[PDB]
Design an enzyme around this catalytic site. Sequence first.
Site, PDB file in Angstrom:
ATOM      1  CG  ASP A  45      -2.096  12.196   9.038  1.00 56.46           C
ATOM      2  OD1 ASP A  45      -2.862  12.977   9.643  1.00 56.46           O
ATOM      3  OD2 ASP A  45      -2.115  10.959   9.222  1.00 56.46           O
ATOM      4  CE1 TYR A  50      -1.525   5.853  12.450  1.00 53.93           C
ATOM      5  CE2 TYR A  50      -0.519   7.710  11.301  1.00 53.93           C
ATOM      6  CZ  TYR A  50      -1.646   7.002  11.687  1.00 53.93           C
ATOM      7  OH  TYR A  50      -2.893   7.447  11.312  1.00 53.93           O
ATOM      8  CE  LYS A  79      -4.291  11.156  12.533  1.00 54.61           C
ATOM      9  NZ  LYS A  79      -3.050  10.605  11.927  1.00 54.61           N
ATOM     10  CG  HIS A 112      -5.374   8.185  16.291  1.00 52.51           C
ATOM     11  ND1 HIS A 112      -4.036   7.878  16.143  1.00 52.51           N
ATOM     12  CD2 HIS A 112      -5.994   7.696  15.186  1.00 52.51           C
ATOM     13  CE1 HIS A 112      -3.854   7.243  14.998  1.00 52.51           C
ATOM     14  NE2 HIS A 112      -5.027   7.118  14.398  1.00 52.51           N
TER      15      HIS A 112
HETATM   16  N1  LIG Z   1      -8.016   6.636  11.953  1.00 48.85           N
HETATM   17  C1  LIG Z   1      -7.151   7.420  11.324  1.00 48.85           C
HETATM   18  O1  LIG Z   1      -6.924   8.613  11.681  1.00 48.85           O
HETATM   19  C2  LIG Z   1      -6.464   6.866  10.096  1.00 48.85           C
HETATM   20  C3  LIG Z   1      -6.804   5.611   9.601  1.00 48.85           C
HETATM   21  C4  LIG Z   1      -6.212   5.140   8.444  1.00 48.85           C
HETATM   22  C5  LIG Z   1      -5.284   5.921   7.794  1.00 48.85           C
HETATM   23  N2  LIG Z   1      -4.955   7.131   8.292  1.00 48.85           N
HETATM   24  C6  LIG Z   1      -3.923   8.053   7.622  1.00 48.85           C
HETATM   25  O2  LIG Z   1      -4.146   8.034   6.227  1.00 48.85           O
HETATM   26  C7  LIG Z   1      -2.946   7.575   5.559  1.00 48.85           C
HETATM   27  C8  LIG Z   1      -3.261   6.897   4.245  1.00 48.85           C
HETATM   28  O3  LIG Z   1      -4.301   5.911   4.394  1.00 48.85           O
HETATM   29  P1  LIG Z   1      -3.995   4.363   4.164  1.00 48.85           P
HETATM   30  O4  LIG Z   1      -2.615   4.091   4.620  1.00 48.85           O
HETATM   31  O5  LIG Z   1      -5.095   3.543   4.722  1.00 48.85           O
HETATM   32  O6  LIG Z   1      -4.058   4.203   2.574  1.00 48.85           O
HETATM   33  P2  LIG Z   1      -4.252   4.969   1.193  1.00 48.85           P
HETATM   34  O7  LIG Z   1      -3.642   6.319   1.193  1.00 48.85           O
HETATM   35  O8  LIG Z   1      -5.725   4.978   0.801  1.00 48.85           O
HETATM   36  O9  LIG Z   1      -3.520   3.935   0.186  1.00 48.85           O
HETATM   37  C9  LIG Z   1      -2.296   3.321   0.634  1.00 48.85           C
HETATM   38  C10 LIG Z   1      -1.932   2.232  -0.342  1.00 48.85           C
HETATM   39  O10 LIG Z   1      -2.069   2.736  -1.691  1.00 48.85           O
HETATM   40  C11 LIG Z   1      -0.885   2.509  -2.432  1.00 48.85           C
HETATM   41  N3  LIG Z   1      -0.695   3.632  -3.346  1.00 48.85           N
HETATM   42  C12 LIG Z   1      -0.246   4.888  -3.020  1.00 48.85           C
HETATM   43  N4  LIG Z   1      -0.200   5.717  -4.031  1.00 48.85           N
HETATM   44  C13 LIG Z   1      -0.631   4.957  -5.110  1.00 48.85           C
HETATM   45  C14 LIG Z   1      -0.728   5.233  -6.480  1.00 48.85           C
HETATM   46  N5  LIG Z   1      -0.433   6.419  -7.022  1.00 48.85           N
HETATM   47  N6  LIG Z   1      -1.115   4.227  -7.297  1.00 48.85           N
HETATM   48  C15 LIG Z   1      -1.389   3.032  -6.759  1.00 48.85           C
HETATM   49  N7  LIG Z   1      -1.342   2.655  -5.478  1.00 48.85           N
HETATM   50  C16 LIG Z   1      -0.943   3.668  -4.694  1.00 48.85           C
HETATM   51  C17 LIG Z   1       0.228   2.348  -1.405  1.00 48.85           C
HETATM   52  O11 LIG Z   1       1.291   1.486  -1.855  1.00 48.85           O
HETATM   53  P3  LIG Z   1       2.800   2.001  -1.858  1.00 48.85           P
HETATM   54  O12 LIG Z   1       3.185   2.476  -0.474  1.00 48.85           O
HETATM   55  O13 LIG Z   1       3.611   0.804  -2.317  1.00 48.85           O
HETATM   56  O14 LIG Z   1       2.904   3.105  -2.951  1.00 48.85           O
HETATM   57  C18 LIG Z   1      -0.499   1.731  -0.215  1.00 48.85           C
HETATM   58  O15 LIG Z   1      -0.471   0.315  -0.295  1.00 48.85           O
HETATM   59  C19 LIG Z   1      -2.231   6.759   6.622  1.00 48.85           C
HETATM   60  O16 LIG Z   1      -0.844   6.609   6.349  1.00 48.85           O
HETATM   61  C20 LIG Z   1      -2.473   7.618   7.858  1.00 48.85           C
HETATM   62  O17 LIG Z   1      -1.655   8.784   7.864  1.00 48.85           O
HETATM   63  C21 LIG Z   1      -5.524   7.613   9.412  1.00 48.85           C
HETATM   64  C1  LIG Z   2      -6.593  -0.033  17.061  1.00 48.78           C
HETATM   65  C2  LIG Z   2      -5.731  -0.660  15.936  1.00 48.78           C
HETATM   66  C3  LIG Z   2      -4.477   0.139  15.619  1.00 48.78           C
HETATM   67  C4  LIG Z   2      -3.729  -0.370  14.421  1.00 48.78           C
HETATM   68  N1  LIG Z   2      -2.510  -0.872  14.516  1.00 48.78           N
HETATM   69  N2  LIG Z   2      -2.142  -1.273  13.261  1.00 48.78           N
HETATM   70  C5  LIG Z   2      -3.183  -1.001  12.378  1.00 48.78           C
HETATM   71  C6  LIG Z   2      -4.204  -0.415  13.058  1.00 48.78           C
HETATM   72  C7  LIG Z   2      -5.403   0.079  12.273  1.00 48.78           C
HETATM   73  C8  LIG Z   2      -5.350   1.596  12.101  1.00 48.78           C
HETATM   74  C9  LIG Z   2      -5.954   2.428  13.040  1.00 48.78           C
HETATM   75  C10 LIG Z   2      -5.802   3.801  12.973  1.00 48.78           C
HETATM   76  O1  LIG Z   2      -6.440   4.697  13.783  1.00 48.78           O
HETATM   77  C11 LIG Z   2      -7.402   4.189  14.707  1.00 48.78           C
HETATM   78  C12 LIG Z   2      -5.016   4.384  11.972  1.00 48.78           C
HETATM   79  O2  LIG Z   2      -4.719   5.692  12.055  1.00 48.78           O
HETATM   80  C13 LIG Z   2      -4.483   3.534  10.998  1.00 48.78           C
HETATM   81  N3  LIG Z   2      -3.771   4.077   9.836  1.00 48.78           N
HETATM   82  O3  LIG Z   2      -3.245   5.174   9.941  1.00 48.78           O
HETATM   83  O4  LIG Z   2      -3.742   3.416   8.809  1.00 48.78           O
HETATM   84  C14 LIG Z   2      -4.630   2.163  11.051  1.00 48.78           C
HETATM   85  C15 LIG Z   2      -5.415  -0.615  10.919  1.00 48.78           C
HETATM   86  C16 LIG Z   2      -6.637  -0.628  10.201  1.00 48.78           C
HETATM   87  N4  LIG Z   2      -7.605  -0.649   9.588  1.00 48.78           N
HETATM   88  C17 LIG Z   2      -4.326  -1.205  10.368  1.00 48.78           C
HETATM   89  N5  LIG Z   2      -4.232  -1.807   9.177  1.00 48.78           N
HETATM   90  O5  LIG Z   2      -3.156  -1.367  11.066  1.00 48.78           O
END
Ligand SMILES: NC(=O)c1ccc[n+]([C@@H]2O[C@H](COP(=O)([O-])OP(=O)(O)OC[C@H]3O[C@@H](n4cnc5c(N)ncnc54)[C@H](OP(=O)(O)O)[C@@H]3O)[C@@H](O)[C@H]2O)c1
Ligand SMILES: CCCc1n[nH]c2c1[C@@H](c1cc(OC)c(O)c([N+](=O)[O-])c1)C(C#N)=C(N)O2
Length: 318
Positions: A45, A50, A79, A112
Amino acid sequence: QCVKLNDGHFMPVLGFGTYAPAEVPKSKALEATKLAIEAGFRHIDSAHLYNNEEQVGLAIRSKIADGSVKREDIFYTSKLWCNSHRPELVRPALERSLKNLQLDYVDLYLIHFPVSVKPGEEVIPKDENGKILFDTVDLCATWEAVEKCKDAGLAKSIGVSNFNRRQLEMILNKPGLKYKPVCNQVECHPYFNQRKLLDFCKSKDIVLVAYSALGSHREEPWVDPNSPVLLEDPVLCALAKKHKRTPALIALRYQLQRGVVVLAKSYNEQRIRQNVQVFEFQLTSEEMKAIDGLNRNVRYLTLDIFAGPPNYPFSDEY
Ligand SMILES: NC(=O)c1ccc[n+]([C@@H]2O[C@H](COP(=O)([O-])OP(=O)(O)OC[C@H]3O[C@@H](n4cnc5c(N)ncnc54)[C@H](OP(=O)(O)O)[C@@H]3O)[C@@H](O)[C@H]2O)c1
Ligand SMILES: CCCc1n[nH]c2c1[C@@H](c1cc(OC)c(O)c([N+](=O)[O-])c1)C(C#N)=C(N)O2
């Protein structure tokens, strides 16, 4: 290991998240995605936002080159960012991603986020008072442009992210709809388990994809450091000790057994390898219920800076 989508394509239920805070060098996204694939991840993803699609594409293509995987074994998500919601700009945006990736298609293209901002290279354009320069776009028009991308074969499937129920209904009930969203990628974890939105999505054959499944990146200023740390949760840690797993694995398993596709980011080799172990065990009904109790109805990602405009998705109950 895969769920069948409403357009007939297949999505691996575990996905590798690639977003990392700015401080992290882009070279890490390349190394991290390679490790993820080597550890077993087949669902990747990412997003134009990003700023890593060059690195993520290279990791994918290098794992194709060394013979580890075929393209068809990989499910890659990109996205469309809010600065290209305008219909005429949707395809140039996907094509730009494909150019950065050096891939022929994405498996999945999402809107997105539903609030539009002014067209331009800046992903968060602001005025002199540091106010966001919002745009005015009919997301239905955006969806039609997104549909043409599937017609053109640039994206195998199409979907949305951060849509509430009414926004889903806007697309779903739109005159002349060609394709339903295959998914709604949203925040989902035991502290915010999206039960109502999940029930709504299932009823329409939309997959819910959980991001921030482990309690999110907790990046400041975006996230309050006083917010509960999901992986330090009493119940998750107790389930972890009991199953000889970890809180992360419990949180991931929870989404799987309730029919949610689940994302997990990590740039650490050990945790990357750990997270795929989600397939090695199962929770009981009673444990699932206990995890259900964790719900707090509070988000790690509110994006307050996007609040105001009529498309801000998080003001409705769901
Ligand atoms: N609006 C959107 O569409 C949106 C928004 C937010 C996120 N996302 C997507 O979702 C993905 C993941 O979400 P997220 O980045 O917010 O966080 P997450 O997957 O909930 O957690 C990320 C954090 O957890 C830690 N971690 C990972 N595996 C672990 C484990 N086994 N034990 C302990 N800690 C662990 C990571 O540290 P380390 O890297 O040091 O392991 C990192 O600091 C993003 O990369 C992105 O692709 C999408
Ligand atoms: C508009 C702000 C954009 C932005 N730039 N840097 C960011 C963002 C926010 C974000 C928005 C995302 O989709 C709207 C998203 O996919 C993800 N993600 O993948 O973690 C993160 C965010 C938060 N919370 C954090 N910590 O960093």
